[PDB]
Amino acid sequence: AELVTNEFAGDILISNTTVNIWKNDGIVSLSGTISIYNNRNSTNALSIQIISSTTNTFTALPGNTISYTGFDLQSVSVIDIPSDPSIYIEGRYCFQLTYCKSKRDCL
Amino acid sequence: AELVTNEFAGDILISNTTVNIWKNDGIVSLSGTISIYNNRNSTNALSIQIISSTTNTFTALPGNTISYTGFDLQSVSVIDIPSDPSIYIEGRYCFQLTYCKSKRDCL
Amino acid sequence: AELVTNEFAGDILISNTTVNIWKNDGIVSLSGTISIYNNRNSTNALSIQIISSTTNTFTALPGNTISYTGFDLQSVSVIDIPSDPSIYIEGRYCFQLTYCKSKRDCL
Amino acid sequence: AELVTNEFAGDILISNTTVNIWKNDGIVSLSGTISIYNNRNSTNALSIQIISSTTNTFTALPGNTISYTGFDLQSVSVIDIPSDPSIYIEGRYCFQLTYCKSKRDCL
Amino acid sequence: AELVTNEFAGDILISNTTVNIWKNDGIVSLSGTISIYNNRNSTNALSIQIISSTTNTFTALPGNTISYTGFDLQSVSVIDIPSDPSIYIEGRYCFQLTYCKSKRDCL
Amino acid sequence: AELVTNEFAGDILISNTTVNIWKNDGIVSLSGTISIYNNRNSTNALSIQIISSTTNTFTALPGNTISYTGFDLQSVSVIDIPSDPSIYIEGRYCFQLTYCKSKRDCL
Amino acid sequence: AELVTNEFAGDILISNTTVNIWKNDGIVSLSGTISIYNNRNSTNALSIQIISSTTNTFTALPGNTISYTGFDLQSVSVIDIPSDPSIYIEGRYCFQLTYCKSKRDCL
Amino acid sequence: AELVTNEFAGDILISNTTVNIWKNDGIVSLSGTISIYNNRNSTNALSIQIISSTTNTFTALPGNTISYTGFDLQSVSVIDIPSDPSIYIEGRYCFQLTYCKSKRDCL
Amino acid sequence: AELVTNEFAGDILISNTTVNIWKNDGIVSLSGTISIYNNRNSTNALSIQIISSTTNTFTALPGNTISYTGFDLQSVSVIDIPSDPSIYIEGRYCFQLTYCKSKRDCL
């Protein structure tokens, strides 16, 4: 076996609903770091649920990045989106995820 | 054997049909991450079907990236394209795919 | 033995004929990803035939990239080029190809 | 096993409360360096609590970066935020964290 | 032994003759990819002969890149250059060549 | 075990006190290089104490960088800061620190 | 032993003489690629002698690069420089040379 | 054990005294290259003493770089600084130093 | 043991004397490539002596780079500098040097 690391980023734009921004397949064991930035021009805090072996909730105020590092990462969702007609949340995420891949069944 | 990683990106432009944007050969076992961005200037949501050992459907609203990580990735298609004469969907995809390659039958 | 990866790109300009854009030597076993972009300024769809252990045909509409990943890649050709005197197709391709090379007969 | 290093940065904006800016999952053993910059345009000092096997408190004056290197890094928080209605603290953090990951349970 | 890869590019300017643009020494066993671009401002097609274990001839129309991947690469020549006093062919080549080198007779 | 290298930089701004700019946890054995620059616009010399297995004091005049390389690096402090109401010291530091990390207790 | 690769470039300016542009020490066994460009503003062809186990002569017309790949590379010289008072040859070379180096007599 | 390389640069500004610009701890065995540049705007030569297993003195005239490569590098100092009230020496140094670090006493 | 490669460059400015631009310590066995450029604005040729197991002399005319590759490189000097009051030689050197370093006496 060898470890494989994937590094990726993405955008969040919101302008009580849950929006899933990342998930695994329920099979892959993923460890690593998740970072979520909420832009300083956002009207509201960004509430994030990270599901691993535990459920953790974080709040990023406008202009702040939250970061989490752990094992068995399963999903990341934006939660508790307020029902404000003037809502504007601009954000960015970055992920560094590592899993293990077998080389036995190699073509 | 050794693992090989391919990293590639591409564009999506749509201006109920299914459009296949990526597929494998049905033989290669591919693991990795797929990211699909729908540009903020799009008129509609981008519906994506990812086929692996399971079929998953995702929806990217304008200005959002969806990401998926899994084993046995087989195809990615845009699905549920609406019959609107004013439709405009601009998007981008990024893939990090890893497979296993033998070194036995080497020239 | 070791695996070798070649990464290369090239241009397509057309302004029923078949144009071969890439082929192997018929000996090298090549696996990897092929991406074909058809520029948004093209007048027509780009029809592509990829020959491996199977023959696959793809169509890239103007502004779209098609991608394929597989084993035993042998050739890529533009096919079904229409007999229009006003035809303009501008495109680009990208390839990530991996083969296996012996180190026994080393100088 | 192999070591994995994650490198990440983020922003701090404050305009007695504690704000957690980074934490681990309580399982991952993280070693590395933490750097915290307080911008020269800040009105106040930035007080930082780093929790590892010990609790350390640091103060970054406006225009200064503090750095810490250690084992068993668990969390970083902004602490002792003053109750001033004219407070403005702009900062940045950088982290280089290394953990160990097994390759036994590899897919 | 170890494999060595050389990557190089060069220019072609023509403004029935054969022009050799690359050759080996007749001893080194070279495998890899050859790409030949003919610029869109060229007046004529670029005819290329690639000698390996077989002789292959390719034609690049103005604005097109041809690519070839194989073993035992020996030479590349421009062939069938027309006797036109107004001829202008501007082109570029790219090569990724791999050979094997012994470490027995090491100083 | 494997070696881990951390590379980091930071700013110094002073506008007899001791200011600690970096320290370890008292457990990690760190080897490497420390460089301290005092900007040419500074009014005074920058006095630096580097604690390792020995205590070394250095003085960087305005526009000069001092560098030190050694084992068992423990802390770096600015020392002997003069009581001048017109003092202005702008500086920068750079560190390349290497430690050893076990892979026995790997998750 | 290990292989070492050196990559270097240089300029040629001439404004029947032989000019040696590169040579080895007569001991080192060098394999690799030599590329010689003759600038499009040159008045004359650039004649190049490459000495290896064989002597090869090449001619680069203005605006062309010649390339050679082989073993036992010993020297490269400009040859057959014409006795023209208005001669102007501007050129560039690039070399990728690999040799083998022992690690037995290591300090 | 593994080798560690540190690469660093710094500035020299002088506007018979000895100024130590770099030293080791007297324990670390450092091998590598030292380069010292004296700027073309300097009024005087830069005299440099490099202490290793031997003491070497070098002189860099304005606009020249001196370089030295050796084992057991211990210190570099500017020496023989003239007592001229109009002296201006601007310089830069670059170091590539390699030492050996054990992995036995790893945390 | 492992091989270590140092890569460095420097400037030459002269505006019969010998100027040593590089030397080793007389202990380190250095192999590699030396390149010496003489700028096109120089009034005179640059004569270079390279000492290895043999003494070689080279002449770089204005606008030319000379290159040499060999074992047991010991020193490079500018030689035969003419006694002209209007002399101006601007040059640059580049070195890629490899030596062998033991890991037995590791701290």
PDB file of N, CA, C and O in Angstrom, chain G residues 2 4-13 20-25 27-28 30 88 93 97 99-107, chain I residues 1-3 27-33 35 37 40 53 56 58 62-71 96 98-102:
ATOM      1  N   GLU G   2      25.953   6.779  -8.411  1.00  0.00           N
ATOM      2  CA  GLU G   2      24.752   7.474  -8.860  1.00  0.00           C
ATOM      3  C   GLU G   2      25.051   8.233 -10.153  1.00  0.00           C
ATOM      4  O   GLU G   2      26.193   8.622 -10.421  1.00  0.00           O
ATOM      5  N   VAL G   4      24.619  11.653 -12.322  1.00  0.00           N
ATOM      6  CA  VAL G   4      24.505  13.104 -12.154  1.00  0.00           C
ATOM      7  C   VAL G   4      24.176  13.700 -13.516  1.00  0.00           C
ATOM      8  O   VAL G   4      24.821  13.351 -14.503  1.00  0.00           O
ATOM      9  N   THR G   5      23.188  14.579 -13.570  1.00  0.00           N
ATOM     10  CA  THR G   5      22.848  15.338 -14.778  1.00  0.00           C
ATOM     11  C   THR G   5      23.192  16.799 -14.562  1.00  0.00           C
ATOM     12  O   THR G   5      22.814  17.374 -13.546  1.00  0.00           O
ATOM     13  N   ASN G   6      23.911  17.375 -15.523  1.00  0.00           N
ATOM     14  CA  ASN G   6      24.147  18.804 -15.604  1.00  0.00           C
ATOM     15  C   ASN G   6      23.353  19.362 -16.782  1.00  0.00           C
ATOM     16  O   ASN G   6      23.398  18.800 -17.885  1.00  0.00           O
ATOM     17  N   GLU G   7      22.661  20.460 -16.542  1.00  0.00           N
ATOM     18  CA  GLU G   7      21.943  21.204 -17.574  1.00  0.00           C
ATOM     19  C   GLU G   7      22.514  22.622 -17.630  1.00  0.00           C
ATOM     20  O   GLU G   7      22.594  23.311 -16.615  1.00  0.00           O
ATOM     21  N   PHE G   8      22.944  23.045 -18.811  1.00  0.00           N
ATOM     22  CA  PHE G   8      23.525  24.363 -18.997  1.00  0.00           C
ATOM     23  C   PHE G   8      23.255  24.900 -20.402  1.00  0.00           C
ATOM     24  O   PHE G   8      23.031  24.148 -21.346  1.00  0.00           O
ATOM     25  N   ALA G   9      23.298  26.210 -20.533  1.00  0.00           N
ATOM     26  CA  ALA G   9      23.142  26.918 -21.783  1.00  0.00           C
ATOM     27  C   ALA G   9      24.233  27.977 -21.943  1.00  0.00           C
ATOM     28  O   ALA G   9      24.905  28.353 -20.979  1.00  0.00           O
ATOM     29  N   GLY G  10      24.414  28.457 -23.164  1.00  0.00           N
ATOM     30  CA  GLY G  10      25.374  29.507 -23.445  1.00  0.00           C
ATOM     31  C   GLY G  10      25.110  30.175 -24.778  1.00  0.00           C
ATOM     32  O   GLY G  10      24.320  29.695 -25.592  1.00  0.00           O
ATOM     33  N   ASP G  11      25.785  31.288 -24.987  1.00  0.00           N
ATOM     34  CA  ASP G  11      25.635  32.110 -26.176  1.00  0.00           C
ATOM     35  C   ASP G  11      26.815  31.926 -27.140  1.00  0.00           C
ATOM     36  O   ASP G  11      27.938  31.609 -26.744  1.00  0.00           O
ATOM     37  N   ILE G  12      26.539  32.112 -28.431  1.00  0.00           N
ATOM     38  CA  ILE G  12      27.514  32.097 -29.525  1.00  0.00           C
ATOM     39  C   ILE G  12      27.370  33.431 -30.261  1.00  0.00           C
ATOM     40  O   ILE G  12      26.273  33.794 -30.664  1.00  0.00           O
ATOM     41  N   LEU G  13      28.479  34.133 -30.466  1.00  0.00           N
ATOM     42  CA  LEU G  13      28.509  35.362 -31.253  1.00  0.00           C
ATOM     43  C   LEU G  13      29.780  35.413 -32.097  1.00  0.00           C
ATOM     44  O   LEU G  13      30.897  35.445 -31.570  1.00  0.00           O
ATOM     45  N   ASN G  20      36.079  26.234 -30.238  1.00  0.00           N
ATOM     46  CA  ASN G  20      35.562  25.243 -29.302  1.00  0.00           C
ATOM     47  C   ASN G  20      34.648  25.934 -28.279  1.00  0.00           C
ATOM     48  O   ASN G  20      35.089  26.844 -27.587  1.00  0.00           O
ATOM     49  N   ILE G  21      33.379  25.502 -28.200  1.00  0.00           N
ATOM     50  CA  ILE G  21      32.384  26.092 -27.285  1.00  0.00           C
ATOM     51  C   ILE G  21      32.199  25.254 -26.018  1.00  0.00           C
ATOM     52  O   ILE G  21      31.910  25.793 -24.957  1.00  0.00           O
ATOM     53  N   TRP G  22      32.400  23.929 -26.117  1.00  0.00           N
ATOM     54  CA  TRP G  22      32.377  23.011 -24.976  1.00  0.00           C
ATOM     55  C   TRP G  22      33.360  21.866 -25.208  1.00  0.00           C
ATOM     56  O   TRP G  22      33.525  21.392 -26.335  1.00  0.00           O
ATOM     57  N   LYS G  23      33.991  21.397 -24.138  1.00  0.00           N
ATOM     58  CA  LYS G  23      34.701  20.126 -24.116  1.00  0.00           C
ATOM     59  C   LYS G  23      34.647  19.489 -22.731  1.00  0.00           C
ATOM     60  O   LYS G  23      34.481  20.183 -21.728  1.00  0.00           O
ATOM     61  N   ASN G  24      34.820  18.166 -22.690  1.00  0.00           N
ATOM     62  CA  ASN G  24      35.063  17.439 -21.443  1.00  0.00           C
ATOM     63  C   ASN G  24      36.568  17.423 -21.100  1.00  0.00           C
ATOM     64  O   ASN G  24      37.392  18.059 -21.771  1.00  0.00           O
ATOM     65  N   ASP G  25      36.923  16.682 -20.043  1.00  0.00           N
ATOM     66  CA  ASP G  25      38.310  16.511 -19.577  1.00  0.00           C
ATOM     67  C   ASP G  25      39.048  15.322 -20.219  1.00  0.00           C
ATOM     68  O   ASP G  25      40.198  15.052 -19.873  1.00  0.00           O
ATOM     69  N   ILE G  27      38.230  12.231 -19.618  1.00  0.00           N
ATOM     70  CA  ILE G  27      38.064  11.140 -18.656  1.00  0.00           C
ATOM     71  C   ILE G  27      36.584  10.823 -18.433  1.00  0.00           C
ATOM     72  O   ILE G  27      36.170   9.665 -18.482  1.00  0.00           O
ATOM     73  N   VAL G  28      35.774  11.845 -18.206  1.00  0.00           N
ATOM     74  CA  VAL G  28      34.347  11.697 -17.917  1.00  0.00           C
ATOM     75  C   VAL G  28      33.590  11.140 -19.133  1.00  0.00           C
ATOM     76  O   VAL G  28      33.651  11.701 -20.226  1.00  0.00           O
ATOM     77  N   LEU G  30      30.297  11.094 -20.818  1.00  0.00           N
ATOM     78  CA  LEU G  30      29.102  11.929 -20.868  1.00  0.00           C
ATOM     79  C   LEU G  30      28.140  11.461 -21.952  1.00  0.00           C
ATOM     80  O   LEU G  30      28.509  11.357 -23.119  1.00  0.00           O
ATOM     81  N   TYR G  88      27.788  38.090 -39.466  1.00  0.00           N
ATOM     82  CA  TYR G  88      27.125  38.194 -38.166  1.00  0.00           C
ATOM     83  C   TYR G  88      26.380  36.893 -37.888  1.00  0.00           C
ATOM     84  O   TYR G  88      25.379  36.587 -38.537  1.00  0.00           O
ATOM     85  N   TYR G  93      23.291  27.732 -27.399  1.00  0.00           N
ATOM     86  CA  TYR G  93      23.331  26.295 -27.172  1.00  0.00           C
ATOM     87  C   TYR G  93      22.676  25.924 -25.849  1.00  0.00           C
ATOM     88  O   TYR G  93      22.648  26.714 -24.907  1.00  0.00           O
ATOM     89  N   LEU G  97      23.638  16.884 -20.039  1.00  0.00           N
ATOM     90  CA  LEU G  97      24.678  15.864 -19.984  1.00  0.00           C
ATOM     91  C   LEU G  97      24.565  15.046 -18.704  1.00  0.00           C
ATOM     92  O   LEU G  97      24.468  15.601 -17.611  1.00  0.00           O
ATOM     93  N   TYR G  99      26.540  11.919 -16.457  1.00  0.00           N
ATOM     94  CA  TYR G  99      27.675  11.054 -16.172  1.00  0.00           C
ATOM     95  C   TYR G  99      27.399  10.206 -14.926  1.00  0.00           C
ATOM     96  O   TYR G  99      26.385  10.379 -14.248  1.00  0.00           O
ATOM     97  N   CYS G 100      28.301   9.271 -14.631  1.00  0.00           N
ATOM     98  CA  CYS G 100      28.216   8.416 -13.460  1.00  0.00           C
ATOM     99  C   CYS G 100      29.301   8.803 -12.451  1.00  0.00           C
ATOM    100  O   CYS G 100      30.454   8.990 -12.834  1.00  0.00           O
ATOM    101  N   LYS G 101      28.951   8.911 -11.166  1.00  0.00           N
ATOM    102  CA  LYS G 101      29.892   9.267 -10.091  1.00  0.00           C
ATOM    103  C   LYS G 101      29.862   8.232  -8.975  1.00  0.00           C
ATOM    104  O   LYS G 101      28.807   7.923  -8.429  1.00  0.00           O
ATOM    105  N   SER G 102      31.047   7.721  -8.609  1.00  0.00           N
ATOM    106  CA  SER G 102      31.213   6.804  -7.485  1.00  0.00           C
ATOM    107  C   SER G 102      30.945   7.492  -6.142  1.00  0.00           C
ATOM    108  O   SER G 102      31.130   8.697  -5.984  1.00  0.00           O
ATOM    109  N   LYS G 103      30.528   6.693  -5.148  1.00  0.00           N
ATOM    110  CA  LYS G 103      30.368   7.100  -3.744  1.00  0.00           C
ATOM    111  C   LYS G 103      31.286   6.314  -2.806  1.00  0.00           C
ATOM    112  O   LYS G 103      31.032   6.285  -1.605  1.00  0.00           O
ATOM    113  N   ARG G 104      32.317   5.646  -3.341  1.00  0.00           N
ATOM    114  CA  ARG G 104      33.230   4.827  -2.527  1.00  0.00           C
ATOM    115  C   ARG G 104      34.209   5.685  -1.739  1.00  0.00           C
ATOM    116  O   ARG G 104      34.327   5.516  -0.528  1.00  0.00           O
ATOM    117  N   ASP G 105      34.845   6.632  -2.411  1.00  0.00           N
ATOM    118  CA  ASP G 105      35.846   7.531  -1.829  1.00  0.00           C
ATOM    119  C   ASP G 105      35.187   8.821  -1.336  1.00  0.00           C
ATOM    120  O   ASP G 105      35.425   9.921  -1.827  1.00  0.00           O
ATOM    121  N   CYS G 106      34.270   8.639  -0.384  1.00  0.00           N
ATOM    122  CA  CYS G 106      33.434   9.716   0.118  1.00  0.00           C
ATOM    123  C   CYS G 106      34.029  10.295   1.403  1.00  0.00           C
ATOM    124  O   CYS G 106      34.355   9.551   2.328  1.00  0.00           O
ATOM    125  N   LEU G 107      34.105  11.604   1.469  1.00  0.00           N
ATOM    126  CA  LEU G 107      34.484  12.346   2.665  1.00  0.00           C
ATOM    127  C   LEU G 107      33.240  12.783   3.455  1.00  0.00           C
ATOM    128  O   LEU G 107      32.202  13.121   2.833  1.00  0.00           O
TER     129      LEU G 107
ATOM    130  N   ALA I   1      27.187   6.749   2.395  1.00  0.00           N
ATOM    131  CA  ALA I   1      27.469   8.013   1.748  1.00  0.00           C
ATOM    132  C   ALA I   1      26.325   8.456   0.824  1.00  0.00           C
ATOM    133  O   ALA I   1      25.539   7.650   0.321  1.00  0.00           O
ATOM    134  N   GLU I   2      26.259   9.738   0.577  1.00  0.00           N
ATOM    135  CA  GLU I   2      25.404  10.340  -0.441  1.00  0.00           C
ATOM    136  C   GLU I   2      26.189  11.397  -1.215  1.00  0.00           C
ATOM    137  O   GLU I   2      27.143  11.994  -0.707  1.00  0.00           O
ATOM    138  N   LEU I   3      25.771  11.621  -2.467  1.00  0.00           N
ATOM    139  CA  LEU I   3      26.267  12.732  -3.267  1.00  0.00           C
ATOM    140  C   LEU I   3      25.524  14.011  -2.880  1.00  0.00           C
ATOM    141  O   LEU I   3      24.317  13.986  -2.623  1.00  0.00           O
ATOM    142  N   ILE I  27      40.949  19.165  -0.424  1.00  0.00           N
ATOM    143  CA  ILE I  27      40.537  17.873   0.143  1.00  0.00           C
ATOM    144  C   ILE I  27      39.324  17.316  -0.608  1.00  0.00           C
ATOM    145  O   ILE I  27      39.301  16.152  -1.011  1.00  0.00           O
ATOM    146  N   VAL I  28      38.299  18.139  -0.818  1.00  0.00           N
ATOM    147  CA  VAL I  28      37.058  17.730  -1.472  1.00  0.00           C
ATOM    148  C   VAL I  28      37.296  17.356  -2.933  1.00  0.00           C
ATOM    149  O   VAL I  28      37.827  18.141  -3.718  1.00  0.00           O
ATOM    150  N   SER I  29      36.857  16.148  -3.333  1.00  0.00           N
ATOM    151  CA  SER I  29      36.847  15.729  -4.732  1.00  0.00           C
ATOM    152  C   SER I  29      35.563  16.203  -5.406  1.00  0.00           C
ATOM    153  O   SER I  29      34.475  15.669  -5.156  1.00  0.00           O
ATOM    154  N   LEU I  30      35.676  17.210  -6.261  1.00  0.00           N
ATOM    155  CA  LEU I  30      34.564  17.857  -6.936  1.00  0.00           C
ATOM    156  C   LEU I  30      34.536  17.512  -8.424  1.00  0.00           C
ATOM    157  O   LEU I  30      35.518  17.718  -9.137  1.00  0.00           O
ATOM    158  N   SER I  31      33.415  17.027  -8.902  1.00  0.00           N
ATOM    159  CA  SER I  31      33.134  16.844 -10.321  1.00  0.00           C
ATOM    160  C   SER I  31      31.985  17.744 -10.749  1.00  0.00           C
ATOM    161  O   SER I  31      31.101  18.040  -9.942  1.00  0.00           O
ATOM    162  N   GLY I  32      31.943  18.121 -12.009  1.00  0.00           N
ATOM    163  CA  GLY I  32      30.813  18.887 -12.509  1.00  0.00           C
ATOM    164  C   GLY I  32      31.128  19.747 -13.713  1.00  0.00           C
ATOM    165  O   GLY I  32      32.064  19.472 -14.466  1.00  0.00           O
ATOM    166  N   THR I  33      30.309  20.780 -13.898  1.00  0.00           N
ATOM    167  CA  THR I  33      30.420  21.702 -15.022  1.00  0.00           C
ATOM    168  C   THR I  33      30.665  23.127 -14.542  1.00  0.00           C
ATOM    169  O   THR I  33      30.035  23.600 -13.599  1.00  0.00           O
ATOM    170  N   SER I  35      30.771  26.992 -16.338  1.00  0.00           N
ATOM    171  CA  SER I  35      30.463  27.856 -17.482  1.00  0.00           C
ATOM    172  C   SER I  35      30.918  29.281 -17.175  1.00  0.00           C
ATOM    173  O   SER I  35      30.630  29.799 -16.098  1.00  0.00           O
ATOM    174  N   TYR I  37      30.823  33.111 -18.933  1.00  0.00           N
ATOM    175  CA  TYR I  37      30.327  34.055 -19.928  1.00  0.00           C
ATOM    176  C   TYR I  37      31.150  35.341 -19.894  1.00  0.00           C
ATOM    177  O   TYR I  37      31.413  35.886 -18.824  1.00  0.00           O
ATOM    178  N   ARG I  40      29.029  40.840 -24.078  1.00  0.00           N
ATOM    179  CA  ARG I  40      29.240  41.450 -25.395  1.00  0.00           C
ATOM    180  C   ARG I  40      29.752  42.896 -25.363  1.00  0.00           C
ATOM    181  O   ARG I  40      30.227  43.396 -26.375  1.00  0.00           O
ATOM    182  N   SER I  53      42.790  17.648 -12.421  1.00  0.00           N
ATOM    183  CA  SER I  53      43.923  16.745 -12.636  1.00  0.00           C
ATOM    184  C   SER I  53      44.847  17.225 -13.769  1.00  0.00           C
ATOM    185  O   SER I  53      46.023  16.872 -13.822  1.00  0.00           O
ATOM    186  N   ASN I  56      43.780  23.371 -17.863  1.00  0.00           N
ATOM    187  CA  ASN I  56      43.205  23.781 -19.137  1.00  0.00           C
ATOM    188  C   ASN I  56      43.048  25.295 -19.168  1.00  0.00           C
ATOM    189  O   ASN I  56      42.584  25.898 -18.202  1.00  0.00           O
ATOM    190  N   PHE I  58      41.198  28.384 -21.476  1.00  0.00           N
ATOM    191  CA  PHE I  58      40.146  28.712 -22.420  1.00  0.00           C
ATOM    192  C   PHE I  58      40.117  30.226 -22.638  1.00  0.00           C
ATOM    193  O   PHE I  58      40.516  30.995 -21.772  1.00  0.00           O
ATOM    194  N   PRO I  62      34.153  38.362 -26.383  1.00  0.00           N
ATOM    195  CA  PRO I  62      32.961  39.100 -25.985  1.00  0.00           C
ATOM    196  C   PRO I  62      31.682  38.500 -26.572  1.00  0.00           C
ATOM    197  O   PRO I  62      31.610  38.210 -27.767  1.00  0.00           O
ATOM    198  N   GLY I  63      30.670  38.293 -25.734  1.00  0.00           N
ATOM    199  CA  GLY I  63      29.390  37.683 -26.097  1.00  0.00           C
ATOM    200  C   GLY I  63      29.372  36.151 -26.107  1.00  0.00           C
ATOM    201  O   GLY I  63      28.344  35.574 -26.479  1.00  0.00           O
ATOM    202  N   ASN I  64      30.446  35.467 -25.708  1.00  0.00           N
ATOM    203  CA  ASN I  64      30.526  34.005 -25.723  1.00  0.00           C
ATOM    204  C   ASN I  64      30.602  33.419 -24.314  1.00  0.00           C
ATOM    205  O   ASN I  64      31.255  33.968 -23.427  1.00  0.00           O
ATOM    206  N   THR I  65      29.990  32.243 -24.149  1.00  0.00           N
ATOM    207  CA  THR I  65      30.164  31.384 -22.979  1.00  0.00           C
ATOM    208  C   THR I  65      31.019  30.178 -23.348  1.00  0.00           C
ATOM    209  O   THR I  65      30.718  29.485 -24.313  1.00  0.00           O
ATOM    210  N   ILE I  66      32.062  29.901 -22.570  1.00  0.00           N
ATOM    211  CA  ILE I  66      32.797  28.634 -22.603  1.00  0.00           C
ATOM    212  C   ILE I  66      32.274  27.731 -21.480  1.00  0.00           C
ATOM    213  O   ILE I  66      31.972  28.207 -20.383  1.00  0.00           O
ATOM    214  N   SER I  67      32.224  26.423 -21.729  1.00  0.00           N
ATOM    215  CA  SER I  67      31.862  25.437 -20.716  1.00  0.00           C
ATOM    216  C   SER I  67      32.852  24.273 -20.682  1.00  0.00           C
ATOM    217  O   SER I  67      33.397  23.860 -21.706  1.00  0.00           O
ATOM    218  N   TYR I  68      33.097  23.736 -19.481  1.00  0.00           N
ATOM    219  CA  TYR I  68      33.975  22.591 -19.230  1.00  0.00           C
ATOM    220  C   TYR I  68      33.309  21.648 -18.232  1.00  0.00           C
ATOM    221  O   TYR I  68      32.747  22.105 -17.243  1.00  0.00           O
ATOM    222  N   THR I  69      33.391  20.348 -18.468  1.00  0.00           N
ATOM    223  CA  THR I  69      32.898  19.319 -17.545  1.00  0.00           C
ATOM    224  C   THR I  69      34.006  18.322 -17.236  1.00  0.00           C
ATOM    225  O   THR I  69      34.623  17.798 -18.160  1.00  0.00           O
ATOM    226  N   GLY I  70      34.256  18.053 -15.951  1.00  0.00           N
ATOM    227  CA  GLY I  70      35.315  17.142 -15.551  1.00  0.00           C
ATOM    228  C   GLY I  70      35.278  16.726 -14.084  1.00  0.00           C
ATOM    229  O   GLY I  70      34.427  17.169 -13.306  1.00  0.00           O
ATOM    230  N   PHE I  71      36.236  15.850 -13.717  1.00  0.00           N
ATOM    231  CA  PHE I  71      36.492  15.409 -12.348  1.00  0.00           C
ATOM    232  C   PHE I  71      37.614  16.229 -11.695  1.00  0.00           C
ATOM    233  O   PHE I  71      38.351  16.938 -12.376  1.00  0.00           O
ATOM    234  N   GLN I  96      28.024  23.912 -11.412  1.00  0.00           N
ATOM    235  CA  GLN I  96      27.278  22.782 -10.868  1.00  0.00           C
ATOM    236  C   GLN I  96      28.303  21.739 -10.413  1.00  0.00           C
ATOM    237  O   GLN I  96      28.837  20.990 -11.230  1.00  0.00           O
ATOM    238  N   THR I  98      29.463  18.524  -7.846  1.00  0.00           N
ATOM    239  CA  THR I  98      29.034  17.396  -7.021  1.00  0.00           C
ATOM    240  C   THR I  98      30.215  16.783  -6.292  1.00  0.00           C
ATOM    241  O   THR I  98      31.240  16.488  -6.908  1.00  0.00           O
ATOM    242  N   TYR I  99      30.057  16.533  -4.989  1.00  0.00           N
ATOM    243  CA  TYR I  99      30.999  15.793  -4.155  1.00  0.00           C
ATOM    244  C   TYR I  99      30.273  14.664  -3.414  1.00  0.00           C
ATOM    245  O   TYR I  99      29.043  14.539  -3.472  1.00  0.00           O
ATOM    246  N   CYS I 100      31.036  13.822  -2.726  1.00  0.00           N
ATOM    247  CA  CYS I 100      30.514  12.730  -1.923  1.00  0.00           C
ATOM    248  C   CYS I 100      30.695  13.042  -0.440  1.00  0.00           C
ATOM    249  O   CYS I 100      31.769  13.475  -0.027  1.00  0.00           O
ATOM    250  N   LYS I 101      29.654  12.818   0.384  1.00  0.00           N
ATOM    251  CA  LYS I 101      29.701  13.062   1.833  1.00  0.00           C
ATOM    252  C   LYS I 101      29.293  11.812   2.608  1.00  0.00           C
ATOM    253  O   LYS I 101      28.227  11.248   2.377  1.00  0.00           O
ATOM    254  N   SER I 102      30.141  11.410   3.560  1.00  0.00           N
ATOM    255  CA  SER I 102      29.861  10.303   4.465  1.00  0.00           C
ATOM    256  C   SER I 102      28.713  10.634   5.429  1.00  0.00           C
ATOM    257  O   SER I 102      28.482  11.787   5.782  1.00  0.00           O
TER     258      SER I 102
END
